[PDB]
């Protein structure tokens, strides 16, 4: 675990304000260099004063909310700013700890709050917190916090997702300063503040970081806890566990211990128990004798008790077989890009249950916070990925890159190691794992996640030829991508069934382990129908899907333990001849309306769920 | 002005919390009667305990976020609930005034907060506030506010929008308890909490209600103010006015006065000044000797100085001619229904400027709060309507209804009488104004708005035959709806030009006043093209639009002072053979993508704006 | 042999059952135009659906009749024009006599085709009139004084007990559009409003029925859960309820069903009409819609019992 701690801001005796939503002053900086953004030090004086500002909502990518194409396709530094009114009690009580938090930035964020640079963060789709209390009480008066944040370009060889810039000196074509951003992943690299931006508070001695690990021992389960405090010297920690509402069912005492909750009541996925995702709540209460007396702090952490093992043929949750029949989603939708949205979150979770998908994959990057949604009665199992996307070029597998991927895997695991929904990790999606250097890098990143977190298996999804895949000897469960009929053998659904059964036989015969069909599908646009299936047509999709399902059924109850149709929905991708206004490969439209294939998938998922 | 006061919660020395966003427990109540919602008194014990609850986001209509058709088309009582954590200072300082506010409910809302029924409100698309401080400090301890709200059906003969229920006792057709909601307006009656839900605080003696009226007197303008306080006895009011940033440019002192700000700097609409919507800020500071000493309160109200007159031929803003070339919008979008959304607000305001529309009409009902958006540099003039929609049946014009419309017009005017953007009121849209009773009712409602607010003209838009329209002698400016080629003379764009010029001549020749083409357009779906224009086709729309513009150009610089193409975008309507998945009459799709007609409109709007 | 009971349509003595469609002579560019490419394509989709029947919607076609007889075996309902008989104006003797003439031309053109199992004198005319009940009286009569080899009928969209022409036909043709046209979007209402409509008509006319028209208008790329309007899904929900209903009367006394159109076709202009009628299960350009698939599972199913 990296030097710090992370728990999600959820008020109780010590609350949270939130500009996590709202309008914001904004500005893009360009014409040539990194530009004046820093050569004029815009940070030391209200953006408006610097030059022509604009409005920006949060959470929301700035890409689509405007009418200007150069902002849509910008690469460089981008600014924000907001003027908060600090409560009086905020700035005059010394027991309160006021922390600024961001749910996510881009490849680089610089926050200028506390009369200066207060925070910086590198890449990731993850959050970062600053300050302890210090709100520049030293010479101020009217508590008005001025926040400024600067953010960066699409990608680089050392970040994740990986990219590559490249200038093109007027070779008869391309203007003077023309440069381009080359990327190797299937999605548009949206930017801007797309998640939570909320100021919050705790006492000075706060429950910095808990952590629970669970299991099952006949007479019920038993939550094992770890806690971390920050400060004082003198304090006391006593934890208690309440069931469905608040029936106190257990109590421990220390900054380390156990909790054997009898009666039992595990966290089952939408799949099996009639009463699935069962959440018990852990109440961490700490009383510390600080400077100005013994202050207290509480947190309460939803604890879901469940076990996740694996064999050479079958995946097992709560010690019983579990077949994955879910989907791969994404954070995308008209206007807002990847910005967080409560209604689109709710619709999407009603559709998942509507379909009968009891699981999904954090498609190429960690998600908002809704991993708690997976926890709630919902019971939607999750395969958590980190941005190891376009790891195709051999250069992207250099040692700094490897050190970086080990950093990001500590953050991703920090943030989601508490969710009973997450049952597996993914360190990468379709890397050049056939390459020799990459197999090393993979064993590295992977063996590293096995440490830090020994509770659930690790893996990386691949489109690599068996026998040609170098990383595969190190994954605990096989994840395969194959688009037979698509990408190759254009229009040949008569081949799918054949080419499939083999890929599985070859994979298991070599690597003795559970395979998951982590990706399959055809690019379909609505309103296109052709009797003989043909191209980007609704029936074709029903045909490939139908045929793929045909191959999964032969080995499903053997060593194939999962199924993830490609996309839940259509999303935006970078502009290419093969991409028609994005990746039209989803069973639901971008506006969550179903396609003919959806109904079909819904039938299978429910049939299986009933077996 | 009705017994109360309303100002928008905007923190300063006395802040605001906000669950205005978030997830919420929810439940619809039905199977027959008003049902058990009250016969079991669900309000006196956590919804979960009552029965099977569900999640609901706010702001968002509950109509579309689910997969169940009976929730989509429900009529009756609907519940919500949330458990807030009250700050300690919240509940232990007696100087703080903690008010619960809702941005809007439906035809009926019942809020159960303060250990009981704390608030109720009838219809409208407007807000309501409760409590003063009383947070049940009397016998509580851990400040956890439990809020409950119940909401009602689609419509009735006395509400606004007007409706009619009707049972149909199994006449061979229709099941046992089958009843239907008959309505007479062109939109889907979405429900649920669709706007702000935010708890806030002030001291006990607070600036309850200000109000400014402005003008121009050669050497600059002069803001005239009114203030209202609530409580104490002893206090002092001194106001000051700062320009573009904070150059103090004026100061007054009292709870009534003037403010003659020299140098001048009026609020111009996107239309004319290169520096348009200029907002000065008014700082209301009040110090009152209460119980526990002289507490203070501040508000700061954006004041935009501008004058709006009218003649028998031309409309005049800032004393110069002003031609309306805007649009009619709506609150609607995939998933969220009519829920508030910051990114969709920003996109929509970029498109308005993109088009060149310097004005819009609050299409059949008051909008969220974004009337401040109209104020901001944007400078987007606004014609504010109240829900006088399906006033078609003669029954809907009964005396209680008339009293009601006078109530709602006090609220609508309370809430928006401060916006320098609003330049006109509309008390109704297409009423049966030919009917005799309705003309009386209209003169009533109208003469009533002229009182309360004598700053800007009043009107109601009509599709009534001149000579047949009874209310028309009472409007200050004529608003006409006509869909020549559409609705009649199906496909005859060769007639538009003819039928138009006449409607105008007949209207002005009788009624000597400025006409505004408040509505025109053709139902167009994207991807449909036909050389000879034809039906629901993009070219046809370019043709009718093109032809309508042809008729407006003849009288535009005479007595026709405005233009409002029908819809900015496509929206959802109740299901009918004439409505294809809603009102497809907009120049932009539901997802804000432009149609071929948009480009055309954009050209005209900009051409005119340049004249 | 083409017989007819009080409860069934007999073909060579073995009880029959129409499970086809209602078509039209409408194509892109060529409109009413005729050609073998579309002609053949159509018969291909026809055998495809399992449609073993089809009515010549509102007029006598071109040489498809040669085709139905031809190596196919698609039992047609030969239909004379006489469809817009809305106004009582259209009820004078002059025109009664005019209609009278065409039934000669039409039988004089199709007498021999084995395909044409039955004549249909008109479609959705103002049958609720006593004068119309007499106009239709004369022609139903005359038609059988021209061809006593097969039944006669006229497509009705009136309520039972107001149909003046109902007492003369030999098989009733009912045009219901529940959920559509009325009680907009109410799928849950269909199954019943339809039972009742087959309960009634029979309790009085005692003849065998044919659901000659049904469906919903649909724009191809449209999709929506909670079915909704001109949506592919809605059609799947409507069609389904109609099928769940007819199934109750099948084997009983209903002897056929005819999903409105085979494909979309142009119409005159109206805010109710998108770019002609859209109620078709194949696009104007002959491609399937989702339901085109749901109908054919019905057809082969039925044809297999
Ligand atoms: C926030 O956003 C920032 C903006 O995106 C971002 O900065 C950018 O980072 C990327 C990341 O790599 C940089 O991209 C690389 O650029 C290298 C070239 O760098 C040098 O040249 C730059 C451009 O300079 C010209 O243009 C400027 C803009 O007008 C002018 O100011 C200059 O005067 C100069 O003028 C020319 O350009 C115009 C016309 O084209 C016009 O001005 C004039 O007529 C003239 O033609 C410089 O800006 C840059 O400056 C930095 O470094 C120098 C010292 O090194 C300092 O003096 C500066 O202060 C500054 O620190 C450089 O001088 C490319 O080499 C590089 O390509 C190689 O690597 C990529 C992978 O990224 C490969 O795909 C590619 O094939 C190349 O491969 C090379 O390496 C391989 C091994 O991997 C090797 O085998 C092979 O041989 C090969 O050499 C890539 O394009 C980009 O330059 C930065 N932009 C800017 C504006 O600085 C910043 O990082 C972001 N912040 C964060 C934290 O993310
Ligand atoms: C929150 O949501 C609530 C739910 O929507 C909402 O309440 C509803 O308000 C509407 C508003 O009008 C009401 O609609 C009117 O209903 C009148 C009939 O009312 C009476 O009958 C109701 C139904 O009762 C049957 O059904 C119940 C449900 O199953 C059973 O419990 C009953 O036992 C009864 O059974 C029958 O129904 C079933 C089968 O159909 C089945 O149960 C059984 O087999 C049997 O067949 C009663 O609920 C209602 O009760 C109220 O009033 C009585 C006393 O009067 C009390 O005892 C009750 O406690 C309760 O307070 C009534 O008994 C209609 O008359 C009315 O139609 C007329 O008006 C409309 C305009 O609205 C016209 O369009 C229409 O043409 C009619 O016109 C009439 O007036 C004109 C003048 O304008 C006149 O010229 C003409 O002659 C004509 O008479 C309309 O349909 C609806 O009933 C309420 N629903 C419920 C469930 O109560 C509530 O208001 C919302 N809250 C707020 C604040 O908005």
Swiss-Prot record, chain C:
Locations listed in the record: Lysosome
Top-level taxon of the source organism: Eukaryota
Location of the active site: 124 (proton donor)
A single GO BP: glycosaminoglycan catabolic process
A cellular component annotation (GO) from this entry: membrane
Kinase listed as a keyword: no
Post-translational modifications: N-linked glycosylated with 3 to 4 oligosaccharide chains.
Glycosylation sites: 93, 304
Keyword entries, A-Z: Disease variant, Glycoprotein, Glycosidase, Hydrolase, Lysosome, Mucopolysaccharidosis, Signal
Gene Ontology molecular function: beta-glucuronidase activity; carbohydrate binding; protein domain specific binding; signaling receptor binding
Job description of the protein: Plays an important role in the degradation of dermatan and keratan sulfates.
Disease listed for this protein: Mucopolysaccharidosis 7: A form of mucopolysaccharidosis, a group of lysosomal storage diseases characterized by defective degradation of glycosaminoglycans, resulting in their excessive accumulation and secretion. The diseases are progressive and often display a wide spectrum of clinical severity. MPS7 is an autosomal recessive form with a highly variable phenotype, ranging from severe lethal hydrops fetalis to mild forms with survival into adulthood. Most patients with the intermediate phenotype show hepatomegaly, skeletal anomalies, coarse facies, and variable degrees of mental impairment.
Quaternary data: Homotetramer.
UniProt record similarity statement: Belongs to the glycosyl hydrolase 2 family.
Protein name: Beta-glucuronidase
Taxonomic lineage from the root: Eukaryota, Metazoa, Chordata, Craniata, Vertebrata
């Amino acid at each position: 675990g990296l030097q710090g701690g992370m728990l999600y801001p959820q008020e109780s005796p010590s609350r949270e304000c939130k500009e996590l939503d709202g309008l914001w002053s904004f500005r893009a900086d360009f014409s040539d260099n990194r530009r004046r953004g820093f050569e004029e030090q815009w940070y030391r004086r209200p953006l408006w004063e610097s030059g022509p500002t604009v409005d920006m909502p949060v959470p929301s990518s700035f890409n689509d909310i405007s009418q200007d194409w150069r902002l849509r396709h910008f690469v460089g530094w981008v600014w924000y700013e907001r003027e908060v009114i600090l409560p009086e009690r905020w700035t005059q009580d010394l027991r309160t700890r006021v922390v600024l938090r961001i749910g996510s930035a881009h490849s680089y964020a610089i926050v200028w709050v506390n009369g200066v640079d207060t925070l910086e963060h590198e890449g990731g789709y993850l959050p970062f917190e600053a300050d302890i209390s210090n709100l520049v009480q030293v010479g101020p008066l009217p508590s008005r916090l001025r926040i400024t944040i600067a953010i960066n370009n699409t990608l680089t060889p050392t970040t994740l997702p990986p990219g590559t810039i490249q200038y093109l000196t007027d070779t008869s074509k391309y203007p003077k300063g023309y440069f381009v951003q080359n990327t190797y992943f299937d999605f548009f690299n949206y930017a801007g503040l797309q998640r939570s931006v909320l100021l919050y508070t705790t006492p000075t001695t706060y429950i910095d970081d808990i952590t629970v690990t669970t299991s099952v021992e006949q007479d019920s389960g038993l939550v094992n806890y770890q806690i971390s405090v920050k400060g004082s010297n003198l304090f006391k920690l006593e934890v208690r566990l309440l069931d469905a509402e608040n029936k106190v069912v257990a109590n421990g005492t220390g900054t380390q211990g156990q909790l054997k909750v009898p009666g039992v009541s595990l966290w089952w996925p939408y799949l099996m128990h009639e009463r699935p995702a069962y959440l018990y709540s852990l109440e961490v209460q700490l009383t510390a004798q600080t400077s100005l007396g013994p202050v207290s702090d509480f947190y309460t952490l939803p604890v879901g008790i469940r076990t996740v093992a694996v064999t050479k043929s079958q995946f097992l949750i709560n010690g019983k077989p579990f077949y994955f029949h879910g989907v791969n989603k994404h954070e995308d939708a008209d206007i807002r890009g990847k910005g967080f949205d409560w209604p689109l979150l709710v619709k999407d979770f009603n559709l998942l249950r509507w379909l009968g998908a009891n699981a999904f994959r954090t498609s190429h990057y960690p998600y908002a916070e809704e991993v708690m949604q997976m926890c709630d009665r919902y019971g939607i199992v999750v395969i958590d990925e980190c941005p190891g996307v376009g790891l195709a070029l051999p250069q992207f597998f250099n040692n700094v890159s490897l050190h970086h991927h080990m950093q990001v895997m500590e953050e991703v695991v920090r943030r989601d190691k508490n969710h009973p929904a997450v049952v597996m990790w993914s360190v990468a999606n379709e890397p050049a794992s056939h390459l020799e250097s990459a197999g090393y890098y993979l064993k590295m990143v992977i063996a590293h996640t096995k440490s830090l977190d020994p509770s659930r298996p690790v893996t990386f999804v691949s489109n690599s030829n068996y026998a040609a895949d170098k990383g595969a000897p190190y994954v605990d469960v096989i994840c395969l991508n194959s688009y037979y009929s698509w990408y190759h053998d254009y229009g040949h659904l008569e081949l799918i069934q054949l080419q499939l059964a083999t890929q599985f036989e070859n994979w298991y015969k070599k690597y003795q382990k559970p395979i998951i069909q982590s990706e399959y599908g055809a690019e379909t646009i609505a309103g296109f129908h052709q009797d003989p299936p043909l191209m980007f047509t609704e029936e074709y999709q029903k045909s490939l899907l139908e045929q793929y399902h045909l191959g999964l059924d032969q080995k499903r109850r053997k060593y194939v333990v999962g199924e993830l149709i490609w996309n839940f929905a259509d999303f935006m991708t970078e502009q290419s001849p093969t991409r028609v206004l994005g990746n039209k490969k989803g069973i639901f439209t971008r506006q969550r309306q179903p396609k003919s294939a959806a109904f079909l998938l819904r039938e299978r998922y429910w049939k299986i769920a009933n077996e």
